[PDB]
């Protein structure tokens, strides 16, 4: 006598919020941006190729100085490249070989890396000796992790496959706050430039927004049919993109709380592996698992260019903090810096 | 090139030397994925060939190292983490079973990896286990051998 009434209340709430959303959907981004001059054909060449890995590359991350990038792989080796010179700075061996993601502290002091072992171990780069030692092992996640990101040298936000994101404290090693709003597994994270909100792409085709201090779902976005496999904030911090298996990017907005514009092409019938914006929020690089990534436009869905220098699919990609270049870790154990 | 940059290059070269040594050491290993119902003697046959996270088993048979990753430890959704195990020589199956077989037989990422099927109680190979584990290990080693033949022939362009 209670389930039916609450379910009907939830249905009514969904209907009224969807009507409120549709109320301000009078305009579309395409006709707004039809007047502005398109960028045109963009040619991005593989400036450098970092080799030394011997297995599929699952993730990478640039440092804040945008010169060092740490890349993980199946062989259980964590490598801190020097993008400018393509010479190693460190080569950290991992306890397990199933690392799905890496990270990088904003100060550059600490490095994190996690995977199927349900641990996001934080490494201590600048120690008194010349070897990188594990500094902590954050346990408490029921399932596997997929993205742990560093707020600062002392706060890290994880995102595990047990439908749960947590905010840990490094010295204590325990989660101060827990974010339990998702139903499916979580596959992405993007800390906002002001480091106050983040959006995680779940398996239920819904991406939620949270508050790092409160611990509640501020907003919730739908519009996909398959699991969301990528997430990337707009440089201003008011928009984010969603990459899903349905071969279609989807730009959202925090203030509007609605889809803003779609990115679809029929010739691509393969899913999305990772999405990364540019410095100015104009080019939406999206890496599909059809063995080549391509460059889009954030305003008029113009497939400006394609990065097709990779033997296998592009798994993870990222952009520098100064916008000078992008890199694409692929499944042939190659990192390529495109500029 | 200053002294500091040259010494950094030398350190990087030592790093590549160590990485290449480890890669050559670990290339001779072969990875296998254990997948099945979980209560049909999977641990039994695992201990037969033996003589949080995912259970890992290691053993050598004949100048070749086998790594056997048991997945029964984790009961999460099978499809979501299947993207990590896309590159594996073979999957050993020990006999919802029919649905699991149908799902794994037409996986998009498993269109090249063969499936090894065991009856205790891409090409698919089958064998009926006996008391002597030597026959079963011979069968699995042979099947991995044909998998390696196929991979090498594809690489060289003949296949």
């Amino acid at each position, epitope marked *: 006598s209670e389930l039916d009434q609450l379910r009907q209340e939830a249905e009514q709430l969904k209907n009224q919020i969807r009507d409120a959303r549709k109320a301000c959907a009078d305009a579309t981004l395409s006709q707004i941006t039809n007047n502005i001059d398109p960028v045109g054909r963009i040619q991005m060449r593989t400036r450098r190729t970092l080799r030394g890995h011997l297995a599929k590359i699952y993730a990478m991350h640039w440092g804040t100085d945008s010169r060092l990038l740490v890349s993980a792989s199946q062989d259980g080796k964590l490598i801190i490249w020097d993008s400018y*010179t393509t010479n190693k*700075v460190h080569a950290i061996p991992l306890r397990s070989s199933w690392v799905m993601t890496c990270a990088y502290a904003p100060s550059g002091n600490y490095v994190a890396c996690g995977g199927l072992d349900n641990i996001c171990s934080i490494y201590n780069l600048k120690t008194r000796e010349g070897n990188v030692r594990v500094s902590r092992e954050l346990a408490g996640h029921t399932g596997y992790l997929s993205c742990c990101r560093f707020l600062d040298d002392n706060q890290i936000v994880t995102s595990s496959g047990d439908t749960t994101c947590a905010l840990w404290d490094i010295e204590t090693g325990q989660q101060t706050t827990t974010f339990t709003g998702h139903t499916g597994d979580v596959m992405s994270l993007s800390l906002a430039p002001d480091t106050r909100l983040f959006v995680s792409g779940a398996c239920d085709a819904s991406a939620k927004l949270w508050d790092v201090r409160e611990g509640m779902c501020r907003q919730t976005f739908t519009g996909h049919e398959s699991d969301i496999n990528a997430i990337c904030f707009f440089p201003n911090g008011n928009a984010f993109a969603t990459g899903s298996d349905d071969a279609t990017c989807r730009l959202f907005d925090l203030r509007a709380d609605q889809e803003l514009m779609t990115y679809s092409h029929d010739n691509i019938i393969c899913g999305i592996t990772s999405v990364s914006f540019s410095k100015s929020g104009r080019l939406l690089l999206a890496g599909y698992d059809d063995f080549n990534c391509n460059v889009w436009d954030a305003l008029k869905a113009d497939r400006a260019g394609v990065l097709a220098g990779h033997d296998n699919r592009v798994s993870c990609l990222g952009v520098t903090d100064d916008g000078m270049a992008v890199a694409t870790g692929s499944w042939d154990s190659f990192l390529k810096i495109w500029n | 090139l200053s002294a*500091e940059d040259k010494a950094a290059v030398e350190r990087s070269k030592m790093i590549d030397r160590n990485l290449r040594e480890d890669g050559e050491k670990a290339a001779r290993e072969v990875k296998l994925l254990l997948l099945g119902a979980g209560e049909s003697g999977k641990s039994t046959i695992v201990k037969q060939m033996k003589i949080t996270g995912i259970v890992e088993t290691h053993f050598t048979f004949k100048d070749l190292h086998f790594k056997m990753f048991d997945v029964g430890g984790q009961r999460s959704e099978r499809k979501k983490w299947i993207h990590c195990f896309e590159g594996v020589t073979a999957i050993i199956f020990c006999v919802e079973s029919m649905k699991l077989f149908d799902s794994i037989c037409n996986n998009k990422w498993f269109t090249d990896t063969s499936i090894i099927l065991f009856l205790n109680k891409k090409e698919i190979y089958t064998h009926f286990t006996c008391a002597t584990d030597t026959k079963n290990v011979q069968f699995v080693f042979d099947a991995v051998t044909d998998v390696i033949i196929k991979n090498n022939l594809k690489d060289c362009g003949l296949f």
Partner: single-chain antibody
Amino acid sequence: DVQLVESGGGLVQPGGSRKLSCSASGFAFSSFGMHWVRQAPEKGLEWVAYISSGSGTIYYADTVKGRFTISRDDPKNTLFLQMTSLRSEDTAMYYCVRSIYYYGSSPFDFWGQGTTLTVSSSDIVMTQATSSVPVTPGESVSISCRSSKSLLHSNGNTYLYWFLQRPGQSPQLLIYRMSNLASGVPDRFSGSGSGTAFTLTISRLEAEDVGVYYCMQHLEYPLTFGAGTKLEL
């Protein structure tokens, strides 16, 4: 804690041969490079030798080339210096310094205690015109030393270092690459410069900062130090 204890020396006849066993107890040794810094009695520092990581690079000073050899024993964490034909000017104190090279590293971070050696009886040149600066605590003092050639490189960093040698103590690093600060030093120290004119500024003098300041270049070997400038209360 990090330590580098060396041994040997004490009395040598001219033309002889001795051995110094510099040991780093309980820390990484194969990753670090090592140099040999010899200090003539009541004189400044003078670079002697340097063996790289993996013994793939070995460099001697031009004044000891062919007479000195430097070797390392990684498994037992020892560093060796074989001297041949020990002349009269080789009597000095010999230190052991660690130096690890990578992007963002701080070479010459730690210095050994030093064992004296007694004998019975081109390159970048860097000058410190000032010798003694008697300054009471509390007021900033500027120490400057100039290089013959610009230490700046096409990379954009200048390889000039500053060391503080407290009386009766081994020198320690506090400024590497003319701008940065070594870990474990107060923020009051700060340096600057451009090309050839280098300066060091201390915010305020303490009781423990009294000592002698050295500056050394590191673009290419040999690495010439500078005549130390002493400051007193």
